[PDB]
From a paper:
In this work, we describe the expression, purification, crystallization and structural analysis of the variable fragment of an antibody BCD090-M2, which demonstrated an affinity to the extracellular domain of ErbB3 in preliminary experiments. In conclusion, here were present expression and purification, functional and structural analysis of a new single-domain llama antibody against human ErbB3. The phage display selection of antibodies from immunized llamas and subsequent sequencing allowed the identification of several anti-ErbB3 single-chain antibodies. The surface plasmon resonance experiment confirmed that the recombinant VHH antibody was functional and efficiently bound to the immobilized receptor.
Author numbering: 1 to 128
Amino acid sequence: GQVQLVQSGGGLVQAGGSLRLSCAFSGRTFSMYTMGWFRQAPGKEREFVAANRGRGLSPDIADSVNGRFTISRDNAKNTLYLQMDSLKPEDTAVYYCAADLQYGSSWPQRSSAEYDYWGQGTTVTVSS
């Protein structure tokens, strides 16, 4: 399965504003992958943000962003999204999407080490 994840979106945003991140999947059967968002802030551990399953209806969303960040996938475009609302300075980070084949994966899966494929990352900088 030739798999690649290509991210789009991000950049500068004002505190209180909104951004939507994109993660385009190339390869066979998007729906057999658990897809996750992680972020890396300076001096902090890599943080799980949100994840969903190939055909799942109930995503897993970290407490630190619950009520502000939402996730979905568009199967026609084979693309995963992260909608980030009510952005705060502490949301500044490099954001990555990751994919894991659902044969043998855990659910939920908040450990980055268990994801096999990774996007190139996009930097989100929240200004005040």
